[PDB]
Symmetry: C3
Subunit: 224 residues, 3 copies
Amino acid sequence: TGRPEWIWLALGTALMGLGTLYFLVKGMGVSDPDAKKFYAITTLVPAIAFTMYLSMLLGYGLTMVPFGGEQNPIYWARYADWLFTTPLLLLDLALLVDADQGTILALVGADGIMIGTGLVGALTKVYSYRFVWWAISTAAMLYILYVLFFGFMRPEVASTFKVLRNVTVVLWSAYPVVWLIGSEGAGIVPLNIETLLFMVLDVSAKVGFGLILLRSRAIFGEAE
Amino acid sequence: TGRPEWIWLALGTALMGLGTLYFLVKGMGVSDPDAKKFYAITTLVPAIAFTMYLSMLLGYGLTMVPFGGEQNPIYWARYADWLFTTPLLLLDLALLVDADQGTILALVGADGIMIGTGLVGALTKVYSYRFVWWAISTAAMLYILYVLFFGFMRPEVASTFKVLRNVTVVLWSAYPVVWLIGSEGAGIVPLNIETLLFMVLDVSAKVGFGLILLRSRAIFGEAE
Amino acid sequence: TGRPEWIWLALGTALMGLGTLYFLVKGMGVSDPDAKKFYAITTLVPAIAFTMYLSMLLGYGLTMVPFGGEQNPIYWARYADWLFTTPLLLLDLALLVDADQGTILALVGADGIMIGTGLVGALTKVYSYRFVWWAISTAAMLYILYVLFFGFMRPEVASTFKVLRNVTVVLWSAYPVVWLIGSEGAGIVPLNIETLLFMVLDVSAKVGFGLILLRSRAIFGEAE
Ligand SMILES: *C/C=C(C)/C=C/C=C(C)/C=C/C1=C(C)CCCC1(C)C
Ligand SMILES: *C/C=C(C)/C=C/C=C(C)/C=C/C1=C(C)CCCC1(C)C
Ligand SMILES: *C/C=C(C)/C=C/C=C(C)/C=C/C1=C(C)CCCC1(C)C
C-alpha cells in the first residue's frame, strides 16, 4: 500500500509466518509430553502474531482515533495479538520453572491488565488520559518483571530460564518506551519508525525467544 | 421477522434450547467426576449456541458489511458462538482420549485461530482479501483434523472416539464450503439457504454429537 | 465531571484501588501454594475492577444506546469487569471446597453466559427484548446459586465456605434487581442512584468478600 509502514508490516508478517512454519516442522515427532507443551505454546505465539501482522498489513487491524485534534491511525490489532501471545510467553517461562498455580494466575492476570489497559490507552480520545492508562499498564509490567525476578531446578532449566528472563526484561521493557514516543503517545517518532521498532521487538520476543527455548534440553523431562 | 432466514434461526434457537434442557436433566444426579466433565462441556455447548441463535433471531447478532459494492448482512454472532463452542467440542474429544496438555493447547489454539480468522474474513471490506482469511482459517481447520487423525485406551473409549472423530470431520469440513458459497464468500447461495445449512450443521455438531457422546459408557471412569 | 454519578465512580475507583494495594501487601511473603492461589485470585478481582471503574470515571466505558426513543447512557465497562471477576470469585469458592473440574466448568460457563447475556441485554435497541436477555441471564444466575447450594472438608473450610456462599447469594441476587429498576431496564431509578447501588454491591462483593476470605485459615493447606 501507500502507508509507508507497509514494508515493516509485510516483513513482520513474513518473519512470523516463517517462524511458525519452522517451529511446526521442528516439533514434528516430539513425543515427550513436557516438550510438547513448550512446542505448542511456542509455535502458537508466532502463528497468532502472523495473523495479526497480516491484519495490519491488509488494513483490517487499523482504526482512526481522534485526539489532540487530529485523526490518528492506531493499529489496534497489536493488542489482540498481545492479549494472547504475552501470557503464552509467560506460560513458557512459568512452566520451565514449575511455577505454582497461584504465581501463574498472578502473571497471566497482571499481563491481561497490562494489555487491556494499553488498549484502553490506545483508543482513548482525551489526550492526557492516554498517559494515565500507559502508567497503569506500565505498573502491571513492572509487577510482572518483579515476579520473574523475585517470585521463583535442574541446572539446564536454571540456565535457560535465566537467559530467557533476561531477553524478556530487555525486550518487554522497550515496548512502553516505543508506545510513549510513538503515534499512540507523544507522537515524537512517526508511525513508520514506530512500526519498525515494534516489528524488531516482536520478532525477537517471539521467534528469537522461541529459537532459544526450543534449542534447549530444558524443555524435556529428565529421561534415560 | 421479514428476513426470510428467520425460520431457520427460530428452529435453531428452539433445538439448541431443547437440547440444552435435555442434557441438563440427563446429567442430573451424575456423581462420577469424569462423567461430570463431559456433561458440563456437552451441556454448555448448546446453551451457548442457544444464546447466539436467539441473538441472530432478534437481530442483535447481525451487522451490515460493505463489500463488492453492496451492504451485506453478516451474522457475526455465529463467531462469538463458535469461539467458545468449538474448543469445548475439541475438549470433549481430547478428554475422551486422555490427550497430552500440549496437544490440547495445540488444538484449542489452532481452533481460536480458525474462528478468529474466519471472523476477520467475515468482516473484511476488501472482497478478494476475504478469501485470504478463509484460506488461513481453512489451514487451521486442516491442522485440527490432522491432529485428530495423527496426533493421538479402553475399547469403548476407542470406539466412541472413532465415531465422534468421524462425525467431527464430516460436519466441520462442510462449514468452510458453506461459507465459501454463501453470503460471506462468493454469494452463490442466498443467505436464507446458507442459514438453513449452518442450522443443520450446528444442531448435528452440537446436539447430535452430544447425544452420541453422552449415551456412551466411555464418559465414565472404570468402576466396579 | 458533570455526570452526577461521577462521585460514585470516583469512590469505587478509590476503594477498588485501595483494596488491591491492601491485598497485594497482605499476600507478600505467602509461601503456601494453596494460599497463593487464593491471594492471586482475590487480589486480581479488585485490580480488574479498579481499571474498569476508572474507565467509567474517565468516560471511556460509557456508550449511548438508543431505545425507548431516547439516547440512553449505558456503562458497558461493567460487563468487561464482571466477565473476568465473577468467574474468579466463583473460582475462590470452588477451590475452597475442592470442587470437581466438571463443576468448576459448569460454574464458569454459566457465569460467562450470565454476563454475556446481560451485556447483550444492556446494548439491545428493542426495549422489550432487553428483558428477554435479563431473564436468560437471571436463569443462569439461578443455576449458579443452585450449584453453590446443591452441587457440593476441614471444619474451617466448611465454615468459611458457608459464610462466603451466603454473602455471595445476598449480594449477587441484588444485581438483577438493580439492573431491572435502573437505567438499563425499566428506568425507575436514575443512573446516579443505580451507580451508587452497584458501587456498594461491587465493593462488598470484591473487597468485602476478599477480606473475609483472606482472614480465614481455610486458605492454607493443613500443615504442622
Ligand atoms: C510478542 C509481543 C510482546 C512480547 C509484546 C509485549 C508488549 C508489552 C510488554 C507492552 C507493554 C505496554 C506497556 C507496559 C504500557 C502501555 C503500552 C504497552 C501495551 C505497549
Ligand atoms: C457448533 C459449531 C461448530 C462445530 C462450527 C464449526 C465451524 C467451523 C469448522 C468453521 C470453519 C470455517 C473455516 C474452516 C474457514 C472460514 C470459515 C469458517 C469459520 C466457517
Ligand atoms: C464484582 C461484581 C459482581 C460479583 C457482579 C455480579 C453481577 C451479577 C450477578 C449480575 C447479574 C445480572 C443478571 C443476573 C441479570 C441481568 C443483569 C446482570 C448482569 C446485572
